Every structure is written in C-alpha cells, then in structure tokens.
Ligand SMILES: Nc1nc2c(ncn2[C@@H]2O[C@H](COP(=O)(O)OP(=O)(O)OP(=O)(O)O)[C@@H](O)[C@H]2O)c(=O)[nH]1
C-alpha cells in the first residue's frame with residue numbers, strides 16, 4: 480500500500496486561455512478542477528482550481544512508463560507494487576486576461592510551474608507571455624514548458640514551434656527549462672511529464688521552525704442540507720502554509736480580520752479561533768505543513784467564512800506579531816512594456832495620486848500613491864494588508880485601456 484500523506488509540493492499550471500491547463504491537470508490526477516456554476520456554464524477556469532495525486536515509480540519497468548499515479552505497475556508489465564515517491568498538488572490558474580490578479584494570487588502559492596502552450600495556436604500568445612513574465616517576477620523558476628495539443632498538428636509544425644519556444648527562452652532565466660510535448664485530451668506522453676515533474680520540480684527545502692503562516696485563498700460554510708445537528712461544523716478556511724506548521728487545537732488568528740466599526744472609523748478586528756480539524760483533499764490529519772492546499776476547520780460562525788469571505792487573509796498563531804498596514808512603502812522596479820496586451824505598449828512612470836492594484840501574498844488591494852521617488856513609492860490602501868516578513872514580493876498593476884495590467888514589482892519595506 481501507499482501511505483496517506485499530505486501533498487508536499489504545489490505545482491502551478493499557467494498559460495493562455497483554452498490552451499489546455501485544466502485538461503492537463505485532469506490527465507495527471509483524474510480530477511476536473513472547475514467546481515463553480517459559472518465555470519461550467521462558460522467552459523473556463525475562474526477561481527483557482529486544485530487537484531492532488533500520488534506519484535510513484537515501478538522499479539522493474541523502463542522510464543518514462545515506470546512513472547505512475549496509482550499503486551499499480553500492470554501498465555508497464557509488472558505485478559510489483561510501485562515505490563511511493565511523494566504526493567503532489569496542482570494550482571490551476573485562469574488564463575483569461577481579465578483574471579490576471581487571480582493568477583497572481585495563485586502564483587504566491589507555487590513551488591514550481593508548468594507553462595502550457597498550445598501547439599495549434601500562434602506563439603507567443605498574450606497570456607503565454609504574461610504568465611511567463613509573472614513567474615519570473617514572483618520567482619517561480621522551477622518551470623516546465625508543456626507543448627499541448629500535439630494531437631492536432633503535424634510533426635513538422637510541432638518541431639517548428641518547439642524551436643520558437645527555445646528561442647523565446649534563450650537569454651532569459653528560463654533558457655534551460657525543458658519542453659515536453661503532450662496531448663492532455665488523449666493522455667499522450669503524460670508519463671514523460673511526470674518524470675519531468677520529478678526531475679525539474681523537486682520538493683523545496685522547508686523551515687518548520689519559522690512562525691507558522693498560511694495564505695488564505697478559500698473559505699467555506701461546509702454545512703449541507705439534510706444533515707443531523709451532530710455533524711454540523713464551524714467555518715472552514717482554505718489555503719497554503721508557506722512556513723512553519725499548524726496543529727489541531729492550536730489557537731490561531733486571521734489577519735487583517737473582520738471589517739468593523741471602531742470609534743466612528745472603519746477598522747479590522749483580528750479574528751481569533753482554534754483549529755478544530757485539518758484536511759487535505761478528502762483526508763484528515765492532525766497537523767499541516769507546507770505543500771498542498773489545506774482546509775482548516777475552526778469554531779467560527781460559518782457566516783464569517785461563507786463564499787470566500789476571507790480570501791487574501793493570512794492565518795498565524797494567536798500570539799504572533801504580524802504587521803497589518805494601511806499604508807505601505809514599496810521599493811519598486813517597472814517593466815519596460817505591458818506584456819499582457821495584444822500590442823505591447825511602453826510603461827509610463829508611476830505618478831502621485833494614481834490608483835494602483837497591489838498583489839501581496841494571496842491578497843489583492845487597490846490603493847492611492849501618496850509619494851513617488853526613483854525606486855520608492857508609498858501607497859495608502861483601501862484595506863490593510865498583513866505583511867508577515869520583511870521584503871515580501873509585491874506585484875504592481877495599473878488600469879490601462881480598461882484592464883488591470885501588471886506594470887512592475889517590488890519589495891514591501893517594513
Ligand atoms: N485536441 C486537443 N484539445 C485539447 C487538448 N487539451 C485540451 N483541449 C481542449 O481545449 C479546450 C480548453 O481546455 P481547458 O483545459 O479548459 O483549457 P484551459 O487552459 O484550462 O482554459 P482556461 O482555464 O479557461 O484558461 C477544451 O475544448 C479541451 O477539450 C489536447 O491535448 N488536444
């Protein structure tokens with residue numbers, strides 16, 4: 480048998496709309512990540528998708544067919560049980576250009592990524608470029624490029640595009656990243672991709688002694704109709720543990736917290752609660768570490784957590800000291816051009832009184848620029864952000880031609 484453990488690594492899946500991201504996650508894990516009504520109606524990813532799988536290797540078989548996602552080697556001709564390697568998970572991002580902020584919030588959770596490029600579309604499409612640039616800015620360097628949809632192009636065309644892709648990465652941080660051709664729809668060459676994931680997206684070193692921090696991307700009321708009172712639950716909060724670990728019965732807090740009134744002004748009250756349960760996928764655990772997206776059960780009234788109310792928050796231990804800032808100072812750099820547009824425009828300098836969008840951890844916040852210097856801006860935010868460490872990365876977006884567009888990045892200075 481294989482052990483039941485939490486996933487130990489998060490692999491982003493990014494790329495242009497309809498290039499095959501969600502189908503690729505299904506080919507690997509068996510799971511369709513889209514769970515929302517609007518996603519099914521429109522045939523598109525809107526919220527961050529998620530799926531897990533075990534990975535193992537059949538020691539008697541040849542590679543890449545030796546790599547498997549279930550405890551059997553019958554496919555490669557062996558009756559032996561495969562050796563368990565690790566459990567992995569996928570953060571399936573939307574490719575729609577209007578959903579870039581959602582992609583950026585998912586990128587904060589990624590240990591590595593697969594950039595999916597459709598073989599039957601011109602390269603590089605706007606969000607192929609834009610997601611590539613985002614990965615570079617955020618530092619998600621452990622990249623595999625997957626050339627998808629090879630089932631509907633000639634070998635000549637696939638090879639031509641392959642050369643284009645290598646030339647695109649030439650002279651960049653990604654010069655040496657592998658390109659793996661597959662068909663996500665017909666599950667062709669998926670074994671090679673799993674081998675690639677093992678070689679190129681290793682589980683990173685973690686630090687379990689650091690103060691526990693979870694970035695929140697989901698929150699739920701898990702109570703369903705037709706159930707007895709004796710199995711009703713308090714609010715559940717979902718996200719990624721980025722450092723340290725959490726345990727059942729631990730006293731925790733959600734930051735910035737709840738928007739309330741205090742002294743005729745808007746304030747955020749930290750939400751204190753206790754961990755009642757920990758789940759990854761369909762499995763319960765007593766503790767949670769980095770890797771995978773965890774569901775933290777609490778004793779909170781489920782009205783506080785319903786419908787992703789706490790998206791963008793962080794969770795820490797109750798006694799942790801974490802800055803919660805309404806005004807932030809950012810040491811910044813600007814991109815040369817707006818990469819996500821069908822036409823690349825030059826990026827104008829930041830000016831005082833501009834309203835910008837700031838991506839910090841899993842949070843997305845608008846704010847007004849109160850001060851501009853050569854490499855430093857100060858921003859008055861519409862809602863405060865939890866800044867759990869010095870020199871946290873922020874991505875800066877500006878509204879250009881009716882769309883939020885990534886224009887730069889920086890470090891939040893505390
Ligand atoms: N022929 C062929 N079609 C594919 C392949 N992979 C995906 N598709 C099709 O491409 C369309 C888009 O697939 P999705 O998986 O929804 O693509 P996506 O990148 O997740 O789209 P968004 O999340 O909205 O950005 C669907 O019709 C798929 O069936 C493939 O390998 N070959």
Ligand SMILES: Nc1nc2c(ncn2[C@@H]2O[C@H](COP(=O)(O)OP(=O)(O)O)[C@@H](O)[C@H]2O)c(=O)[nH]1
Pocket residue numbers: 699700701712715756757758759760761774775776
């Ligand atoms: N920690 C914890 N997580 C839960 C509990 N019940 C549900 N979840 C998680 O909360 C998320 C929402 O689940 P739900 O609304 O029931 O949809 P479902 O996963 O399809 O059953 C899922 O990822 C569950 O794994 C619980 O009692 N404790």
Ligand SMILES: [Mg+2]
Pocket residue numbers: 497521522523524
């Ligand atoms: Mg679609």
Ligand SMILES: [Mg+2]
Pocket residue numbers: 500501502523524571572573574
């Ligand atoms: Mg999708």
